[PDB]
């Protein structure tokens, strides 16, 4: 851009140059010109006057855009779009006066944004496919690895590492869904008039509704679009822009949380991000291992939770068939969350390709505290063997209490199974202690409701998207 | 009691039926009543508990001391363990069986589901009403023009119905969104303190099937098609998003809405209804409690949205006082809004003068091509007509603007000999009806083809009054 | 409340009697009364024809309050201020007609939110207080208690539990600051009429411009306000409820932070929340120790942090010089985001109380880590004693890669320092090693700027709040 | 370049003097200052710095490689050490003691609170001026009776200078708030990896009272009077909130103002200087800078320990466009401010249509009610029922039963005297609120 001025971040930082191109000046110019050549052409068929030396002057002027005119031109104007119809027209001097015939400005300036919209989530899409992909991978090859389970941040009965990652999968789907399902409801705008009547096609074209009808029909049709709104006024309803900006939010949130949770395992030293050969952590410590993708991903995320409320509180005001308070906040908004969602799916798809686990400092947290979780299958063992409840329940007290002075008060590790091997008391269980403590036992149903899932639930939602899976996510 | 605080949810805005769902009544009567289901299936599926110990069960659920619940709470700082208790006292020969191999979320997670489920259900047929009454409207002013509004400055005519539908069509958008978040939530089922199972595997003594089958059935009774498989603790928070995501777009619909009819109110095209003995001069006031509470409901959004992205592992309790708040007053606050739109939307009066005034006030502005046009059809230059119309114009908004008068462009144009050859279609070339465009088409085919297809399956709920 | 509708859970759990108190009806329509006596002995005195049997009445019946009856009258009348003039006119009926006289109904319905603000401000910042002072008692007992400090959550220079406990200070007495401004900062509406110009008021005192002056600083005095608003429309200008909701949002965040770190040492035994000694964990596992108070708090903050929105969108969508949309979202955030203010600080003021520290835990966390961060320390040491700086170098980074080795891919305990104590390299030092990882070494001025925090910033903030700091904060839940 | 995409704020609304303040090249200056003023005072206070090494680095404060600082960036993954790699490249004699004592936030801190207080110190005129015109506008205006509006419904009658006042101190609240936010910044200083100076410490072989004079020089230099006694390895981010807060607050004020002259717009009454264009841009944008309010909660709430660094992408967006966004709405509302247009007569007409309804009262007294109840029943039906003007002066008029009055009804209905004290109280605020803020400016 130029580093003497402010540059979005989202653009000299995060996002990919295909998301970076898709919000470009370059994308929206082309696209009203491209919109205004097929506005032309319907016309032209519906019986308009319009000759085809003046469809082939567009034609081959729609790349050929003069910024520095239409700036210049906006400038003089303050409108935006009357400047691009008049530097079109400069350039296609027989068609200048044919151009925009009928249309208010948000023929361009709304059928662009759904345009930009479906194709910015057509984006996003695959790379949630992708890191979907990787997760599940990951979960499937370690759905039998047992890990401590934390409820309140505390140890809890066990679960496996690719059950963990079972959590944050479903939560990916949900959003795979949600993605899935704003991006087919997208229905363009069409031909709509100033006020949404139509008025100024219907006088074109002498009184024909048919005319009218099949105009929005041809030009939706030319875009891509399945369907067009009956119903607008000047513009689409914003209530479109709650819809794309609440899923995207939702998938902020949900991103956070694996992050948040890989954070977490990072301080563990269960569980890392991958690392470059010549990357540093720190300015005093190089060799420090800092989860910094996952804190951009989070960093990032918070954003997109945040933007949420931009497009709620724009429809809650837009009066009657449009005001133009919309205007600036969507020029900012829309294309920041693209940028920052981009962002995250890509920068999460690095992270899951790179997850390294460490097996022996997940079997260390277990052996510190499996112990004080297998009290009651100890008691109950002894039950088994004759013994009574209250006896055995304050003979393990007293131990847990001798162990759990060692850890707290010595800072030093567990001992209550050998304090258990060692008091008599315990001697009818003695040979049944390696059974009793064996984690793959604490671990309940999770290796099978991770099998159950990926069937059942995630490798259908990601058959669709087999030919994406192939490419590979890099950092800068 | 008029001594402490009262949500104004409970004493002012929401319906019985929306407050009794989330009172603590309906909330610990289903926690006995999961644990009822809980004791009936472990007993079917092959534990020791006596049809003794759930013949007391099924006799107590109704009779739940909260006095006994609040004190042992307090002792134990635990409020499904003092209602586990407090259910205990009542069922001596059960006390020991209850909660068996379950955590706390069995009760409180599934409670909340059903909850959500049976609020969202009240919700519906509420907007639907909303939606029939608002299409009611459509087609009956369906081509009555107005003035339309762009920038709020005067712009093409719509019409009344045309604008209506605007109103429609974001509600139909919240009412399917509502169906499908409805339809889409799953039961939490049985599934152990992190989401394994672990404690039921061992009582069942390692069969898996029974595991299965323990959690079929309770999903079952609690009328759910579908459990979820994979859970921690909890049900994923995610699903608190997806509801109070719908509820806050809804509001946002709402307060558009009650936003365009107070400023029709302010130019007395329109009005709400008024009873008798109201005391204000005319307000808004039913429109304007709407946006208040639209506006809270939007503001909730951000409390799922912080809740979820901060839950570690397999749940953390920093989630629990939030979802007390704001589930409740979602739904209270969408309740309250649905009903007082439904009100206003039955009671909607249109003052076609005042319409009329407006719109012949400013058409002939927007007019002033077409009385070229017919100027060139009867022989005249058009740069002449142009010139001249720009002259009367320019005089006519100097009267409107500079004088605070009303606007005589076409008694300036009646007395101008120059346009004698049009004098006589000028009531045609200002006839309101014809610069509406498709306006009324537009309705007839919104109204046929996506409105009514919707509210078909809402037929028998239809009738209530707001 | 009855069990058969929804109740709030910050009146039936959380927030202590005298906060729910003060957003009570009963606090709001005695409010009201009053107001209305102040308005009618005011206009008296400065000439009106109200007797002194109209305002003996006014007098006898201020507590007097027939909620049935003004609930029917609302039913009726549509309208909560005329419901409760009639109301009051009915055990009133000579003063019935000069009750509100000259008044717009935002005379009762803004002064009264004006003064429950002012009441419930004065309710949280000697708890706020309260809680500051606490953290400080434990940051001085620990100002020098080596800790290993977390930047990524990751091992970093060691810092102190105090110092640590000051970052927490710091931020609540940004809050408490912003707070006594807010609270001085309110303004009373006074006597304004209709639209903001006092009309009603003018005409009544027949073009007196000073009466009606008069009148205004009359009521804003018996009301215990220094000043009203010179500017108004109908109502104060709702960028005041704002200014009130950011600073308690705010308060949220470090509440926030502050409860969430507290969690996270949960997790490494470094420090834990109060337990009672009857208290559950889980309904699985009694002595599981969860930091459910903290949780409790975070889950709280959350949603004072949350409701900031209401306020800012009310202010900015008010049309002129009132429109009624901000009405009903008022009588649910305002009272809320206090309500959920107050019991946080209760709370955490309570965990500030018990906080238990682990110093054992503590010591084995900085053994385990410490050899890593003090490798540039025993290099200096060898160069020091004859050694050249880039075999030293090489010589620890080969052995702190063994180590490393050791605790993530075999799971065992950092042994670097018995790695270097067996390598006869580093020979020269072997004698220093106790003195090179002393962690108290490590601690940079940790203890000093704690006590340079406390003495210059702290304790001035403290000194006003004295007399409320013997009260022990208490939960039933 | 039109092949990627441009901030709006960049490209389309904010001046460049605040485009400027966020720019790389701002930003990258700064940190290489902040590296010359630590030389700078390490030397004085006796770290072995020469003359030469600070000099190098005197001259290459703004000769800043950015290509080399991306590709280092790129290899390093670490923004600070791509900065002192590059700027040892361009100064090798001064190389090696770069960055000596510190940790990135010495650089990366330091210069986003010198960016705020800079930014800061660009609204705040900016904001004076605005105030100061509507002032001028609300004097003018004082004594111009127009309609009250209370539910968007008419009202007792205001004056445009008074409602101009309801503005106006919205936005006196504002520049009190800015201001106050401006002067308490502190700055952070010089605190190491965790905030306790250890390596410092060191370097002056434990003297303390050299690290306070190192924070304190450092902080001087800064043009800051106070520094953090306590931090982390950041500054708290509660401050974030603070600053965000006041701006957030400021959107709110400025979108309730443009809403208004939105609506005066429709209504005729008053117009910026057809479409309010700039008015709806203001709103558009404040309500942006509304949103933005819950990022450093958000951040702020969960930052553990000593750092995090999950607050550094979203402070590089939020901050930057908090401000940017700020000063377009200010600058706009400016010029907005600098040449409203009144249409009295406009005002006028629609007074005369709704007071009669509002002067019933005083034509009762002046009688001294069931008649008046009457004709202003016919008069509302010919308003509301038939469109027609309000003619309940002319229907009693036209009653002998009013005939007492005929001769008074001049005076009974005169606009002027039912605008209450509007014209004082917009004197008394000007003088005793408005101009006191003011006159610093
Ligand atoms: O086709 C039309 O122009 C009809 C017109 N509505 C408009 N529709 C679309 N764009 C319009 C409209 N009006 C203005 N502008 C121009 O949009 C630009 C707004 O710039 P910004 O606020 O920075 O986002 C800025 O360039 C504005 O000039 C109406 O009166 O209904
Ligand atoms: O262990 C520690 O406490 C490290 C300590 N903390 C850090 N302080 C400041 N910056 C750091 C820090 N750490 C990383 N980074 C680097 O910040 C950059 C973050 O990039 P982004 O997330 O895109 O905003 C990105 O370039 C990051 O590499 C330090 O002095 O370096
Ligand atoms: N894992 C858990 N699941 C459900 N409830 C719990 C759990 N742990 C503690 N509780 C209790 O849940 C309640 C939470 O209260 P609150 O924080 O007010 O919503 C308290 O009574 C807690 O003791
Ligand atoms: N201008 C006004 N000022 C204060 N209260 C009003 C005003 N207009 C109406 N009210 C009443 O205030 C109450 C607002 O109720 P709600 O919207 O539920 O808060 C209703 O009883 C209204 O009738
Ligand atoms: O004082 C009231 O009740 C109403 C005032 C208004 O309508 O503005
Ligand atoms: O109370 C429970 O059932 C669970 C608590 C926990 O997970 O610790
Ligand atoms: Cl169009
Ligand atoms: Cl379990
Ligand atoms: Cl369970
Ligand atoms: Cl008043
Ligand atoms: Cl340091
Ligand atoms: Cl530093």
Request: aromatic share 8%; glycine share 4%.
């Amino acid at each position: 851009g130029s580093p003497d001025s402010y540059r979005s971040p989202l653009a000299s930082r995060y996002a990919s140059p295909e998301m970076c191109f898709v919000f470009s000046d370059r994308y929206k110019f082309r696209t009203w010109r491209q919109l205004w050549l097929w506005l032309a052409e319907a016309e032209q068929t519906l019986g308009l006057p319009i000759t085809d030396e003046q469809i082939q002057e567009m034609k081959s002027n729609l790349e050929n855009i003069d910024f520095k005119m239409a700036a210049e031109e906006e400038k003089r104007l303050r409108h935006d779009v009357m400047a691009h119809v008049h530097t079109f027209g400069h350039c296609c001097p027989k068609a200048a006066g044919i151009i925009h015939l009928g249309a208010t400005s948000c023929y361009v300036g709304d059928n662009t944004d759904l345009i930009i919209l479906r194709n910015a989530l057509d984006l996003l899409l695959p790379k949630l496919a992708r890191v979907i992909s990787r997760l599940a991978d990951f979960a499937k090859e370690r759905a039998s690895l047992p890990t401590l389970g934390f409820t309140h941040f505390q140890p809890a009965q066990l679960t496996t590492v690719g059950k963990r990652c079972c959590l944050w999968i479903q939560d990916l789907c949900m959003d795979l869904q949600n993605l899935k399902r704003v991006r087919d409801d997208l229905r363009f705008r069409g031909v709509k008039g100033t006020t949404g009547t139509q008025a100024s096609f219907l006088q074109l074209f002498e009184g024909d509704d048919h005319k009218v009808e099949q105009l929005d029909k041809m030009v939706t049709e030319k875009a891509g679009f399945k369907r067009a709104f009956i119903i607008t006024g000047q513009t689409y309803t914003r209530k479109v822009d709650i819809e794309v900006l609440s899923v995207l939010a939702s998938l902020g949130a949900s991103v956070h949380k694996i992050c948040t949770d890989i954070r977490l395992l990072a301080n563990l030293k269960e569980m890392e991000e991958p690392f470059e050969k010549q990357q540093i952590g720190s300015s005093a410590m190089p060799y420090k291992r800092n989860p910094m993708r996952s804190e951009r991903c989070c960093s990032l995320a918070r954003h997109l939770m945040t933007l949420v409320m931009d497009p709620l509180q724009t429809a809650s005001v837009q009066w009657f068939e449009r005001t133009l308070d919309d205007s600036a906040n969507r020029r900012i908004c829309l294309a920041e969350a693209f940028l920052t969602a981009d962002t995250i799916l890509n920068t999460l798809q690095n992270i899951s390709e790179g997850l390294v686990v460490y097996p022996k400092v997940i079997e260390r947290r277990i052996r510190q505290e499996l112990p004080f979780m297998a009290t009651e299958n100890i008691i109950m063992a002894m039950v088994k063997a004759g013994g009574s409840r209250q006896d055995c329940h304050e003979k393990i007290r007293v131990l847990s209490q001798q162990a759990a002075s060692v850890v707290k008060q010595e800072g030093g590790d567990n001992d209550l199974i050998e304090r258990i091997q060692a008091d008599a008391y315990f001697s009818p269980i003695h040979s049944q202690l390696d059974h009793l403590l064996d984690p793959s036992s604490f671990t309940g149903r999770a290796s099978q409701q991770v099998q159950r899932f990926l069937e059942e639930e995630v490798y259908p939602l990601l058959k669709p998207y087999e030919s994406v899976m192939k490419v590979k996510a890099e950092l800068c």
